[PDB]
Amino acid sequence: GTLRVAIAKPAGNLDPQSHYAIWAIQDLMFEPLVKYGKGGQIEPCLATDWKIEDGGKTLHLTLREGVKFQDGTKFDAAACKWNLERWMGIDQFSWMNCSKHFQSLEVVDDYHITVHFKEPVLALMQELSYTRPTRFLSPKSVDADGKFKEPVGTGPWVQISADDTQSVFEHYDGYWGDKPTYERLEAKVIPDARSRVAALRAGEIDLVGGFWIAPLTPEEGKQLEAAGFNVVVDPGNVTLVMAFNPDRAEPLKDPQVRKAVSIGIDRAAISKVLYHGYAKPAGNMFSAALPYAGKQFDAPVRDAAAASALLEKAGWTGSPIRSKDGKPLTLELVVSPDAVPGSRVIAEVIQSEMKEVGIDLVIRSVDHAEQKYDLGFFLTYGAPYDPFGSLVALCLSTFKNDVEGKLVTDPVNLDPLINAATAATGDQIEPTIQKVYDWLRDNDAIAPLVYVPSIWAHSKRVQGFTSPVTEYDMPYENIVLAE
Numbered sequence: 278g279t280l281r282v283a284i285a286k287p288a289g290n291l292d293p294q295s296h297y298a299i300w301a302i303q304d305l306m307f308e309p310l311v312k313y314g315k316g317g318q319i320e321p322c323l324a325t326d327w328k329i330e331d332g333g334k335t336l337h338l339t340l341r342e343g344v345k346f347q348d349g350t351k352f353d354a355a356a357c358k359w360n361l362e363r364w365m366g367i368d369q370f371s372w373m374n375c376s377k378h379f380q381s382l383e384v385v386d387d388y389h390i391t392v393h394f395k396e397p398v399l400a401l402m403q404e405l406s407y408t409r410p411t412r413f414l415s416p417k418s419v420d421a422d423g424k425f426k427e428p429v430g431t432g433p434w435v436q437i438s439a440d441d442t443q444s445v446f447e448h449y450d451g452y453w454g455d456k457p458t459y460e461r462l463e464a465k466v467i468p469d470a471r472s473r474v475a476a477l478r479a480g481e482i483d484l485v486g487g488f489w490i491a492p493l494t495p496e497e498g499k500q501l502e503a504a505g506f507n508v509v510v511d512p513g514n515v516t517l518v519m520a521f522n523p524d525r526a527e528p529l530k531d532p533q534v535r536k537a538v539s540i541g542i543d544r545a546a547i548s549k550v551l552y553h554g555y556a557k558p559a560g561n562m563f564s565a566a567l568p569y570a571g572k573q574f575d576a577p578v579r580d581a582a583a584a585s586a587l588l589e590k591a592g593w594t595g596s597p598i599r600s601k602d603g604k605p606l607t608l609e610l611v612v613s614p615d616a617v618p619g620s621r622v623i624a625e626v627i628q629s630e631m632k633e634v635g636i637d638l639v640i641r642s643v644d645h646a647e648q649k650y651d652l653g654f655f656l657t658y659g660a661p662y663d664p665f666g667s668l669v670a671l672c673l674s675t676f677k678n679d680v681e682g683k684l685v686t687d688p689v690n691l692d693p694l695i696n697a698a699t700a701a702t703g704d705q706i707e708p709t710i711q712k713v714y715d716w717l718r719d720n721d722a723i724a725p726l727v728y729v730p731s732i733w734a735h736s737k738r739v740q741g742f743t744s745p746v747t748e749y750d751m752p753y754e755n756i757v758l759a760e
């Protein structure tokens with residue numbers, strides 16, 4: 278009656294307002310106001326309803342009645358304020374828009390709270406779905422000093438024990454929502470990916486996978502598949518995107534050349550070599566799994582003939598390599614195997630495919646070690662930060678962060694469309710954001726390659742396995758154990 282799940286390292290300290298735990302573990306007993314559902318659909322959790330007013334500066338919340346914390350204390354407006362007051366407006370959470378713009382917090386009754394903000398809050402509800410710091414810890418569980426002691430949330434699982442070999446949880450009785458069909462969940466610390474594979478084959482664990490839980494590469498997936506195991510691939514929510522730098526590479530200023538580069542590539546071959554066929558070719562910057570991902574298009578199918586024709590219309594002629602005004606069509610793809618595993622390999626598939634359309638792709642393979650590149654690779658941020666996290670961070674000129682880099686920067690043309698989308702409310706977010714995506718697509722400003730898949734495996738006895746919506750969730754839901 279016990280589900281066992283690998284984790285790649287100890288759970289850590291579970292303080293729901295700090296940064297030391299494995300998120301998926303916190304997700305076991307901590308609950309948010311609203312949940313990030315499939316497709317980025319916002320669902321009722323500790324709040325049953327909500328209303329956003331004042332152009333996004335006011336949030337009204339109706340709290341769920343009949344909720345108890347695992348220590349038996351009551352969930353209500355007072356307990357909600359006390360938590361929210363623990364993290365919102367604290368300088369340490371300024372990276373989140375709702376903390377940063379937080380103005381004030383009025384309790385109205387035992388089940389109604391209103392929050393006020395100095396400015397509209399981009400993706401407000403989404404942010405409130407996060408694993409941390411947005412979740413609810415019993416006010417009586419913490420001492421005079423206010424320091425986190427025990428992990429007393431409202432969620433379905435109670436921590437029975439934790440150390441550096443496993444952590445052990447039991448179903449919480451008088452949990453408000455649906456209870457697990459099984460009695461217990463153990464999280465076993467197995468750091469080496471070779472061991473994790475073995476442990477599933479033996480019947481030592483039931484579950485393996487998750488970027489931030491117990492990763493399982495493509496190769497491991499095929500292996501397990503070969504061993505007759507259930508291998509479950511989520512097409513994912515992070516996009517590998519190739520970027521163009523026309524400021525450096527005079528040929529990429531011609532959008533016909535960009536397009537040719539993009540349809541001259543075989544995403545399917547990218548998926549084969551790097552992800553063993555498991556990755557879905559990308560037509561859109563964001564997969565359909567994300568909210569506001571746009572009108573969805575088919576991933577382009579490699580078309581060398583169409584690519585060659587574009588290049589010729591643009592005045593690049595020659596064989597085997599095209600030139601123009603005596604200059605060969607040479608582009609430098611900069612890669613770091615450190616920062617994107619498989620990065621070099623991708624480059625050699627592409628270089629070979631570019632060769633076929635007449636482009637001479639030079640690869641510069643680097644350390645984790647700045648616009649000195651013609652082409653390069655970016656990865657989107659993924660759920661639950663997207664699409665606005667990536668759009669803003671990677672595409673808005675005016676947003677400038679040391680750690681980032683830019684996919685595409687057009688102040689006169691794109692910024693306005695991004696700004697309008699970030700300003701949009703309710704019904705108007707979708708068509709406003711659709712204009713960002715039309716711009717990018719009509720101008721061939723970026724080249725999405727594949728969606729990065731997320732791979733889980735379970736044992737034969739696990740039924741009801743449901744791929745997690747984000748990498749910060751533990752997929753314990755729905756499971757029934759046959760034995």
Ligand code: NA
Nearest residue numbers: 304749750751
């Ligand atoms: Na969850």
